[PDB]
Design a protein around this ligand. Structure first.
Ligand code: CHL
Ligand code: CHL
Ligand code: CHL
Ligand code: CHL
Ligand code: CLA
Ligand code: CLA
Ligand code: CLA
Ligand code: CLA
Ligand SMILES: CC1=C[C@H](O)CC(C)(C)[C@H]1/C=C/C(C)=C/C=C/C(C)=C/C=C/C=C(C)/C=C/C=C(C)/C=C/C1=C(C)C[C@H](O)CC1(C)C
Ligand SMILES: CC1=C[C@H](O)CC(C)(C)[C@H]1/C=C/C(C)=C/C=C/C(C)=C/C=C/C=C(C)/C=C/C=C(C)/C=C/C1=C(C)C[C@H](O)CC1(C)C
Lengths: 219, 201, 219
């Protein structure tokens, strides 16, 4: 319970090998000391990896919640068409464009190239202004700004803020691994991941994974 | 300091230090300096939501869409039960900062991060201009709720029913009409009594 | 219109972020300052990238004109067999070897391994003599020699020559991107790129790209 220090929860815990690599000893969230290949020995490259892992973690957490929500919402009390995240990307082609919430009173996007061009413009703008700063105060911190992106004001107390950092990083790692699981389920069985959830909860051991183990057999 | 009836007095705590201070407080509500601090933003926010409601109430009755007193009655929207629960969480979150930013700074702003001015626009003597617009708008909203009343047509439809027409169909030739004449006659003779209170001191 | 200087046409134009990376400020053609990852920070590696990009650009321009010409020539007034660049490589196997121009009075290459061995010999010779110099004067410049490869003499005036450098680099970038387009059209639809041109000019919006968007669907 001492991540910021030598007594962090190390990568093997009780098999910790307390001779840890000396280029990271606490002082940054998520430092769990698991460097078996050591591709981040250089400090500036290590900083790049911290920034890159933060970006990946936030994007993957957003994607993971985007993979949990719509299927459950269309399963409970709404209808989307194909709420499963496969053909949600092809809902613009089918009959009447991409109607949001499955309702012909919302977005109703007909042409995907317009979404395409506007998406490129907006994403270039926000990513450029993410790197070099810009609106809502010029960006002085590349990792965590501290400017008007926290309109609630939770970043006053430092140790709770650091705990929030560590929670953010751990959540991001879990999100990345889970989205990898989503992608592998997309490849192998190619069905709904929450359909997978319901089917495994209905079938705990009879259809586990290895009925779907003789599919990609070469011959 | 142009008072609410031409030659008037000033109640002993409505001097000229407030913004829209036309010296009108006959029932002595804000006698504190602690509720003035609060009734000011009651005034500004109650007015401010109404200023944002008048635009919608006019456009929905200019363009088409079914009349506002039956707006949510029929609804092609989604899941009447739970979108109100959506309408609870974001709001209470927002209220935390509205009341918090009310507490920590002096009586002016509200948004989540700062006194909200992303522009360099007027933060000047013209806050009386928008509270003046607001106290106009609040009176404008009650009229529309009294048009969802007695006549049952919308704003612009009764606007056509009288406002290209003579004074043959107005308040006093309508359902709730004999009471308004009495209230006009009573309110008009009222500063004639308030002057008699303070002539004899 | 000032590529050789601080006032070059930068990667975003009036969204230029005039705080450009300081390891390139004009003085070389094609410097558009678009370094988002920054894989060419080292100067000698940057020189390698200039040389490598020049080689790629010239090779890709040669390939792009080689992808535009023969199909048009066989569509206009000649016949090649398969003028589309797919089976032009297999025209030696079909019936009578690779007859140039579609004429049994020209190259008529029967055995592809002879082309193979002579091609390796010639290409090793020309690439080795490209690196280290050799014939027609020893190579003293790895980027642009200046020796007897310009038999017309257009490299006298310096600023027009630099403009020619910039045109060459821009044409090469366009050629590389366009050849990437050719390869992607080879993958997805697998038909003639100029057949694609004719079909899209005949069908501007009914068969745009997304009829060919449900082909590589996993299941
Ligand atoms: C004002 C326009 C603006 C908008 C709409 C966004 C929106 C975004 N930013 Mg960004 N940013 C913007 C300006 C800026 N950002 C940043 C610094 C960052 C960082 C470090 C990160 C974002 C991330 C994000 C994404 C999710 C944020 C929650 C989203 C693309 C996050 C992201 O991309 O992951 C999903 C992320 O990690 N922004 C700076 C420098 C202070 C900006 C200055 O203009
Ligand atoms: C449109 C212009 C645009 C620009 C200029 C940038 C620019 C940048 N982005 Mg951004 N982005 C842009 C659009 C978008 N980005 C993102 C999402 C991200 C993320 C998630 C991240 C960035 C990052 C970065 C930075 C460097 C990334 C890089 O080297 O890419 C090179 C990469 C590729 C060309 C593709 C890599 C694919 C990857 C290997 C996936 C492999 C998949 C897995 C193996 C599993 C696959 C399936 C499963 C089932 C097995 C750079 C500043 C990174 C960053 O800021 O790090 C500090 C970062 O982490 N961007 C999205 C969402 C789709 C965009 C949509 O338009
Ligand atoms: C004399 C034999 C000889 C032949 C047939 C070629 C022919 C070629 N050279 Mg080469 N070179 C030759 C000698 C030399 N070259 C070069 C320096 C270069 C360069 C920098 C480049 C070529 C390129 C080329 C190619 C297209 C040129 C137009 C082609 C493979 C270009 C290339 O490979 O792209 C298609 C290219 O960029 N040559 C030098 C050093 C001065 C040489 C000295 O012997
Ligand atoms: C036969 C002996 C031979 C020798 C010794 C050389 C030697 C050399 N060549 Mg040369 N070449 C030779 C034959 C040939 N070359 C070329 C074409 C080129 C080019 C275009 C370039 C060189 C370059 C180089 C230099 C370093 C390239 C390298 O590291 O390769 C390592 C590379 C590979 C083993 C293959 C890389 C493939 C690449 C990743 C393609 C990826 C494709 C795309 C992702 C898209 C694909 C499909 C689309 C639809 C998506 C090196 C001096 C480069 C240079 O001089 O830079 C300064 C350079 O730019 N050569 C051709 C034409 C086919 C040759 C035919 O015989
Ligand atoms: C691309 C995503 C990515 C990146 C850049 C990083 C980056 C980092 N991680 Mg990390 N991590 C990730 C995803 C990622 N992580 C995921 C998904 C998990 C959960 C499984 C973890 C779990 C983890 C732990 C437990 C620890 C780190 C640590 C580190 C740091 C040092 C290790 C290093 O140099 O990594 C460089 C990484 C790369 C160059 C990425 C290469 C990716 C290629 C495609 C190979 C991946 C193939 C993969 C092994 C096959 C199975 C995939 C499946 C497991 C998902 C560095 C900041 C250590 C640290 O000190 O934290 C700060 C540490 O103790 N990570
Ligand atoms: C309801 C919102 C609201 C609120 C909270 C305030 C608050 C305030 N106004 Mg105010 N005002 C409003 C609406 C409001 N106003 C409207 C709509 C008008 C135009 C008609 C005015 C016109 C006005 C003038 C001209 C003056 C004020 C002043 C004041 C301040 C001191 C007087 C006081 O103690 O009031 C406290 C009042 C309340 C707490 C409101 C209580 C609400 C009662 C209990 C119910 C009212 C219902 C009503 C009688 C029935 C509907 C009426 C309809 C039929 C016409 C105080 C900050 C004075 C001041 O200092 O200058 C700014 C002043 O001179 N106001
Ligand atoms: C701020 C006050 C306010 C409130 C409470 C409402 C409330 C409403 N408006 Mg509305 N409106 C407002 C201001 C407001 N409007 C303004 C200022 C305008 C002018 C731009 C409009 C223009 C407008 C139109 C043109 C329509 C509505 C509609 C609606 C209804 C459907 C809401 C919905 O899901 O649509 C989507 C609303 C949002 C996503 C709001 C998010 C921000 C709802 C009763 C619709 C209606 O009545 O259909 C039956 C409708 O067609 N409004
Ligand atoms: C392999 C081909 C290649 C190579 C080596 C370069 C090399 C260079 N380019 Mg360049 N460029 C290319 C192709 C290439 N370019 C193409 C095809 C385009 C048009 C899209 C551009 C457009 C471009 C601009 C606008 C700018 C540069 C710049 C630069 C310089 C610094 C960037 C750098 O370090 O690149 C290193 C590059 C590599 C290590 C190549 C990695 C390739 C792998 C396979 C990843 C590619 C995946 C790709 C993103 C996926 C989509 C492909 C599709 C877009 C074709 C450097 C000399 C900057 C400069 O200052 O110019 C001198 C600059 O401003 N380039
Ligand atoms: C550390 C280390 C160390 C040692 O030494 C070595 C090694 C081992 C190599 C290393 C490792 C590495 C790794 C593992 C990595 C991984 C990563 C990942 C997983 C990522 C993800 C990542 C992921 C991500 C970002 C994601 C993202 C996502 C997204 C956006 C999504 C989107 C979406 C949505 C919303 C929904 C819809 O409907 C669709 C989609 C489209 C789907
Ligand atoms: C810059 C940067 C920056 C940031 O930072 C990062 C990143 C983004 C990564 C980067 C990028 C990169 C890139 C994009 C690259 C690309 C390239 C290319 C496209 C190449 C091509 C390239 C291409 C090329 C050479 C080509 C060549 C070609 C050829 C020879 C051809 C041949 C031929 C012909 C004649 C015809 C016949 O019948 C057949 C064939 C066989 C077909």
């Amino acid at each position: 319970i001492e991540f910021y220090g030598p007594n962090r929860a190390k990568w093997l815990g009780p098999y910790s090998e307390n001779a840890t690599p000396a280029y990271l000893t606490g002082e940054f969230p998520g430092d769990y000391g698991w460097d078996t290949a050591g591709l981040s020995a250089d400090p500036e490259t290590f900083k790049r990896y911290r920034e890159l892992e933060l970006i990946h973690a936030r994007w993957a957490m957003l994607g993971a919640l985007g993979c949990i929500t719509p299927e459950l919402l269309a399963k409970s009390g709404t209808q989307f068409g194909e709420a499963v995240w496969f053909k949600a990307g092809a809902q613009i082609f089918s009959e009447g464009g991409l109607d949001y919430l499955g309702n012909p009173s919302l977005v109703h996007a007909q042409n995907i190239v317009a979404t395409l061009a506007v998406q490129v413009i907006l994403m270039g703008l926000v990513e450029g202004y993410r790197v070099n700063g810009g609106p809502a105060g010029e960006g002085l911190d590349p990792l965590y700004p501290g400017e008007s992106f926290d309109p609630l004001g939770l970043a006053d107390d430092p140790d709770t803020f650091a705990e929030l950092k560590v929670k953010e990083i751990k959540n991001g790692r879990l999100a990345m691994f889970s989205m990898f699981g989503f992608f592998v389920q997309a490849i192998v069985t190619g069905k709904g991941p929450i359909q997978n959830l319901d089917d495994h909860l209905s079938n705990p051991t009879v259809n586990n994974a290895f009925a779907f183990a003789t599919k990609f057999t070469p011959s | 300091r142009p008072m609410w009836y031409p030659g008037a007095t000033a109640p002993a705590h409505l001097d000229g230090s407030m913004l829209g201070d036309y010296g009108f407080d006959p029932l002595r509500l804000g006698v504190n300096k602690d509720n003035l601090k609060w009734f000011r933003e009651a005034e500004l926010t109650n007015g401010r939501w109404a200023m944002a409601a008048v635009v919608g109430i006019l456009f929905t009755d200019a363009v088409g869409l079914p009349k506002f007193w039956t707006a949510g009655a029929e609804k092609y929207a989604l899941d009447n039960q739970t979108l109100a629960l959506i309408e609870v969480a974001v709001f209470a979150v927002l209220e935390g900062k509205r009341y918090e930013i009310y507490k920590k700074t002096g009586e002016t702003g509200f948004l989540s991060f700062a006194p909200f001015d992303p522009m360099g626009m007027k933060s000047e003597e013209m806050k009386l201009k928008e509270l003046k617009n607001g106290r106009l708008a609040m009176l404008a909203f009650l009229g529309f709720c009294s048009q969802a009343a007695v006549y049952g047509k919308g704003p612009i439809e009764t606007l056509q029913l009288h406002l290209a027409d003579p004074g043959h169909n107005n308040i006093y030739t309508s359902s709730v009409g004999p009471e308004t004449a009495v209230t006009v006659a009573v309110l008009c003779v009222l500063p004639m009594i308030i002057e008699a209170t303070k002539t004899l001191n």
